[PDB]
């Protein structure tokens, strides 16, 4: 990979789960370096109007809010993650 992870500073490859901090610094982060769940990562991927903001730094989600929102969506408590922005 060309980009290093904004948390662990090791390379991010395209076959790893990784998310871009579009809210602010435009660095890539390995999913597992952020604490993001698999479900938050999946639901963020497909929500065009959501952007993620990393721990160092349209609807903005931190990892914690995306994780909380995904748990609510999978339990039928929320229609989409946008309800938690």
């Amino acid at each position: 990979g060309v980009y290093p992870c904004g948390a662990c500073r090791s390379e991010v490859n395209d076959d790893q789960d990784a998310i871009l901090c579009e809210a602010s610094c435009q660095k890539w982060f390995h999913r597992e370096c952020t604490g993001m769940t698999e479900s938050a990562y999946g639901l963020l991927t497909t929500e065009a109007s959501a952007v993620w903001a990393c721990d160092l730094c349209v609807y903005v989600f931190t990892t914690h809010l995306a994780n909380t929102a995904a748990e609510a969506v999978l339990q039928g408590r929320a229609d989409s993650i946008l309800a938690y922005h």
Partner: peptide, 6 residues
């Protein structure tokens, strides 16, 4: 949000 799965 842009991820590698995007």
């Amino acid at each position: 949000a842009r991820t590698k799965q995007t």
